[PDB]
Symmetry: D2
Subunit: 140 residues, 4 copies
């Protein structure tokens, strides 16, 4: 009872559960949108399940965007250069969701992802990065 063992046991029990060489998929996004950097004119978009609610965000986010590309960033900004042009990537939680805004040099539009608060921001910034590259690749 409480023996050195029974104590050091419960402690050895606090240890994490290690998963080795596991394959994991994050969930998929909810929205993938393109809005004019200008007023947030939703050009195109895609979902998983109204269009009202979406627009609410296309504008809301864009707001939060120019509010950081001007009013200000050092921590949550992720600057990159694609096809010899530059763009900034921003994350932002809006109503418990993770979102991403980055600009396109070619058309001055904003690319945008919206996802659960269960979608890892890191993978999100990375995901949007390749998205821009692949995007500008198909348009030069």
């Amino acid at each position: 009872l409480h023996s050195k063992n029974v104590k050091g046991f419960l402690e050895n029990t606090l240890k994490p559960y290690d998963l080795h060489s596991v394959d994991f998929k994050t969930s998929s996004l909810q929205s993938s949108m393109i809005i004019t950097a200008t007023n947030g004119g939703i050009l195109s978009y895609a979902t998983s399940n109204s269009v009202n609610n979406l627009k609410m965000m296309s504008l809301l986010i864009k707001d939060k965007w120019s509010e950081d590309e001007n009013d200000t960033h050092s921590n949550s900004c992720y600057p990159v250069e694609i096809d010899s042009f530059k763009t900034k990537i921003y994350t932002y939680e809006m109503e418990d969701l993770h979102t991403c805004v980055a600009q396109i040099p070619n058309s001055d539009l904003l690319l945008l992802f919206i996802a659960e608060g269960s979608f890892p921001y890191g993978l999100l910034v990375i995901k949007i990065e390749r998205a821009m590259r692949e995007l500008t690749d198909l348009f030069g």
Copy 2:
């Protein structure tokens, strides 16, 4: 603008982010306790960071325990047999935490884990299972 491509692009973008052969550790538990099935007399315990708060749970959980081993389970119960004796494992969220209670045949006590609501119940039930085996192994 909105070209078959620009639409089917944003859609191909909704896709998950796949992690391949990744190594992941869950967090470690907060508490690993043994309480008399009887009144919840905390026999031994271990933590990661008062003893008051703990007891609150040792009793609270035990309550929720006998309240299911009698008042009733089919979904959240995970019956097992260790060292030729039987025990039931139960999960239960109490104040946004994941917990586990299973009984020891040898001493009639309850083994108990408490963790964040970020600790996968599956790994938790599995974790406590081996815990019982390893436990009863050192005491026969």
Copy 3:
């Protein structure tokens, strides 16, 4: 150059990358089979993408099964009780794949899962457990 800082920096850099409250799906199984415990007569099965190769396993695994339920287990065995009857769950890597065999009390058959070596055994044992319950539930 090498300043206390530049060293203690690279060290503070060794740290893990923490994902907080993430949603992750494992991959889905490859095969979900039922074989007569007897000779491994594949009764039913399901896949994701020949039937030859499958049978190779239905028998191969079953072999490894009775070779453990008799020839012998303490670490990789996960005994459980479903609908008042008992069954044992076993894991086993065969050609870099994770598999699971457990028996059905009602028909003496073996339930079986086969998956990548990227599918967490823990979740697998847990997955097959509920499978048995849900299985025997629909047949009494």
Copy 4:
């Protein structure tokens, strides 16, 4: 036996195991090094467990580096801009390990991470990115 149910059952069983709002840590790096872009003169470094083997890589990687910053990249390159200067981030598996090389504008050195092949490249590129920022922040 094989009933619509017993088949559609095994199929409903192929489904992934969903982890909801889980907290996961990747493993921690093995090496965090700074080498002169020049010849790979290991300036500073840190580990987790000879110094020989390390150097083998400091040079090996640097080789693979300039071999891509010149000989050539579009997929595995991740250009960024830190503190108004530009740098490129590269990933590269060398002997089943994931590594990262990016250059420092201020000293022309290469920052470098080495990790298991179980460490998600995505998180790695992201991890090194902040590393550069935080690095150049402490030196201006």
